[PDB]
PDB file of C-alpha atoms (C1' of nucleotides) in Angstrom:
ATOM      1  CA  UNK A 652       1.798  10.628-105.570  1.00  0.00           C
ATOM      2  CA  UNK A 653       2.911  12.385-108.682  1.00  0.00           C
ATOM      3  CA  UNK A 654      -0.698  13.492-109.691  1.00  0.00           C
ATOM      4  CA  UNK A 655      -0.517  11.506-113.055  1.00  0.00           C
ATOM      5  CA  UNK A 656      -3.807   9.663-112.293  1.00  0.00           C
ATOM      6  CA  UNK A 657      -6.958  11.747-111.922  1.00  0.00           C
ATOM      7  CA  UNK A 658      -9.786   9.695-110.572  1.00  0.00           C
ATOM      8  CA  UNK A 659      -9.310   7.090-107.810  1.00  0.00           C
ATOM      9  CA  UNK A 660     -11.833   4.240-106.363  1.00  0.00           C
ATOM     10  CA  UNK A 661     -10.617   3.004-103.144  1.00  0.00           C
ATOM     11  CA  UNK A 662     -12.259   1.101 -99.950  1.00  0.00           C
ATOM     12  CA  UNK A 663     -11.408   1.752 -96.325  1.00  0.00           C
ATOM     13  CA  UNK A 664      -8.084   0.097 -97.058  1.00  0.00           C
ATOM     14  CA  UNK A 665      -7.128   3.672 -98.241  1.00  0.00           C
ATOM     15  CA  UNK A 666      -9.759   5.999 -96.830  1.00  0.00           C
ATOM     16  CA  UNK A 667      -9.586   6.405 -93.091  1.00  0.00           C
ATOM     17  CA  UNK A 668      -6.034   7.519 -92.988  1.00  0.00           C
ATOM     18  CA  UNK A 669      -3.262   9.114 -95.651  1.00  0.00           C
ATOM     19  CA  UNK A 670      -1.087  11.724 -96.120  1.00  0.00           C
ATOM     20  CA  UNK A 671      -0.820  13.736 -99.396  1.00  0.00           C
ATOM     21  CA  UNK A 672      -4.548  14.698 -99.533  1.00  0.00           C
ATOM     22  CA  UNK A 673      -6.238  15.396-102.761  1.00  0.00           C
ATOM     23  CA  UNK A 674      -8.438  18.361-103.245  1.00  0.00           C
ATOM     24  CA  UNK A 675     -11.951  16.710-103.165  1.00  0.00           C
ATOM     25  CA  UNK A 676     -13.380  13.596-101.606  1.00  0.00           C
ATOM     26  CA  UNK A 677     -16.864  12.024-102.223  1.00  0.00           C
ATOM     27  CA  UNK A 678     -19.063   9.522-100.741  1.00  0.00           C
ATOM     28  CA  UNK A 679     -21.421   7.223-102.857  1.00  0.00           C
ATOM     29  CA  UNK A 680     -22.967   5.590 -99.647  1.00  0.00           C
ATOM     30  CA  UNK A 681     -24.311   6.498 -96.084  1.00  0.00           C
ATOM     31  CA  UNK A 682     -23.657   2.983 -94.573  1.00  0.00           C
ATOM     32  CA  UNK A 683     -21.094   0.507 -94.063  1.00  0.00           C
ATOM     33  CA  UNK A 684     -20.531  -3.384 -93.467  1.00  0.00           C
ATOM     34  CA  UNK A 685     -18.563  -3.964 -90.157  1.00  0.00           C
ATOM     35  CA  UNK A 686     -18.444  -7.470 -88.645  1.00  0.00           C
ATOM     36  CA  UNK A 687     -21.932  -8.845 -89.333  1.00  0.00           C
ATOM     37  CA  UNK A 688     -24.179  -5.995 -87.743  1.00  0.00           C
ATOM     38  CA  UNK A 689     -24.485  -3.997 -90.880  1.00  0.00           C
ATOM     39  CA  UNK A 690     -24.298  -0.488 -88.820  1.00  0.00           C
ATOM     40  CA  UNK A 691     -23.951   3.145 -89.976  1.00  0.00           C
ATOM     41  CA  UNK A 692     -20.981   5.362 -89.952  1.00  0.00           C
ATOM     42  CA  UNK A 693     -20.055   7.241 -86.677  1.00  0.00           C
ATOM     43  CA  UNK A 694     -18.366  10.522 -86.202  1.00  0.00           C
ATOM     44  CA  UNK A 695     -15.052   8.859 -85.182  1.00  0.00           C
ATOM     45  CA  UNK A 696     -15.033   7.446 -88.884  1.00  0.00           C
ATOM     46  CA  UNK A 697     -16.271  10.449 -90.740  1.00  0.00           C
ATOM     47  CA  UNK A 698     -13.636  12.540 -89.319  1.00  0.00           C
ATOM     48  CA  UNK A 699     -10.904  10.299 -90.151  1.00  0.00           C
ATOM     49  CA  UNK A 700     -11.773   9.614 -93.883  1.00  0.00           C
ATOM     50  CA  UNK A 701     -12.935  13.163 -94.644  1.00  0.00           C
ATOM     51  CA  UNK A 702     -10.629  14.838 -92.226  1.00  0.00           C
ATOM     52  CA  UNK A 703      -7.868  14.869 -95.001  1.00  0.00           C
ATOM     53  CA  UNK A 704      -8.652  17.078 -97.692  1.00  0.00           C
ATOM     54  CA  UNK A 705      -5.944  19.904 -97.163  1.00  0.00           C
TER      55      UNK A 705
ATOM     56  C1'   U B   1     -26.092  -4.120-100.005  1.00  0.00           C
ATOM     57  C1'   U B   2     -20.536  -8.404 -96.821  1.00  0.00           C
ATOM     58  C1'   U B   3     -15.035  -3.675 -95.145  1.00  0.00           C
ATOM     59  C1'   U B   4      -9.922  -4.160 -91.946  1.00  0.00           C
ATOM     60  C1'   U B   5      -5.499  -7.047 -90.255  1.00  0.00           C
ATOM     61  C1'   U B   6      -2.695 -11.171 -88.537  1.00  0.00           C
ATOM     62  C1'   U B   7       6.866 -11.189 -89.855  1.00  0.00           C
ATOM     63  C1'   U B   8      10.143 -15.801 -91.546  1.00  0.00           C
ATOM     64  C1'   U B   9      13.493 -21.581 -94.754  1.00  0.00           C
ATOM     65  C1'   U B  10      20.194 -22.641 -87.201  1.00  0.00           C
ATOM     66  C1'   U B  11      24.528 -18.837 -85.917  1.00  0.00           C
ATOM     67  C1'   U B  12      29.701 -20.850 -86.373  1.00  0.00           C
ATOM     68  C1'   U B  13      34.800 -22.689 -88.646  1.00  0.00           C
ATOM     69  C1'   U B  14      41.710 -20.514 -90.547  1.00  0.00           C
ATOM     70  C1'   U B  15      42.169 -28.543 -85.261  1.00  0.00           C
ATOM     71  C1'   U B  16      48.065 -30.694 -82.828  1.00  0.00           C
ATOM     72  C1'   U B  17      49.533 -36.251 -82.461  1.00  0.00           C
ATOM     73  C1'   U B  18      56.693 -38.927 -82.451  1.00  0.00           C
ATOM     74  C1'   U B  19      54.505 -46.974 -84.535  1.00  0.00           C
ATOM     75  C1'   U B  20      55.667 -52.401 -87.006  1.00  0.00           C
ATOM     76  C1'   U B  21      55.909 -60.059 -88.626  1.00  0.00           C
ATOM     77  C1'   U B  22      54.561 -63.129 -84.321  1.00  0.00           C
ATOM     78  C1'   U B  23      51.962 -63.630 -79.761  1.00  0.00           C
ATOM     79  C1'   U B  24      50.608 -69.202 -75.130  1.00  0.00           C
ATOM     80  C1'   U B  25      51.651 -76.751 -73.475  1.00  0.00           C
ATOM     81  C1'   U B  26      50.410 -82.607 -73.767  1.00  0.00           C
ATOM     82  C1'   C B  27      53.967 -87.960 -71.142  1.00  0.00           C
ATOM     83  C1'   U B  28      56.847 -92.681 -71.197  1.00  0.00           C
ATOM     84  C1'   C B  29      57.164 -96.034 -75.847  1.00  0.00           C
ATOM     85  C1'   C B  30      59.790-105.223 -76.824  1.00  0.00           C
ATOM     86  C1'   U B  31      62.156-103.774 -84.795  1.00  0.00           C
ATOM     87  C1'   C B  32      61.306-112.221 -84.507  1.00  0.00           C
ATOM     88  C1'   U B  33      65.685-116.392 -86.083  1.00  0.00           C
ATOM     89  C1'   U B  34      71.396-120.138 -91.965  1.00  0.00           C
ATOM     90  C1'   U B  35      75.828-117.316 -90.363  1.00  0.00           C
ATOM     91  C1'   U B  36      80.549-115.592 -89.858  1.00  0.00           C
ATOM     92  C1'   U B  37      79.996-110.683 -92.458  1.00  0.00           C
ATOM     93  C1'   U B  38      80.759-111.721 -98.778  1.00  0.00           C
ATOM     94  C1'   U B  39      85.001-109.350-101.304  1.00  0.00           C
ATOM     95  C1'   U B  40      90.606-111.475-106.914  1.00  0.00           C
ATOM     96  C1'   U B  41      89.056-111.682-111.839  1.00  0.00           C
ATOM     97  C1'   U B  42      87.157-109.784-116.783  1.00  0.00           C
ATOM     98  C1'   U B  43      83.920-107.803-120.373  1.00  0.00           C
ATOM     99  C1'   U B  44      79.986-100.809-119.522  1.00  0.00           C
TER     100        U B  44
END
RNA sequence: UUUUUUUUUUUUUUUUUUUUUUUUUUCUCCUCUUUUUUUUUUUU
């Protein structure tokens, strides 16, 4: 919140919705693990994690 | 190459009182033998 930490590593517990967005967001993978079907992401998810950068 | 969420030890306290040991039965009941009754007295 105070900007004293630069690089953050977080799972979906912090991804899909937050206020106070930083400037840049990066993705290290294309897939995700839902409840034992091992699907990929959908636009409803990509909008929320990546829709908060400004 | 396996993420996200599912609360926990019932609330209450700042009510008066002018009595006194016990406690409640048992029925009428043939007394055998020398006597009048002796007696002063003195030594404690």
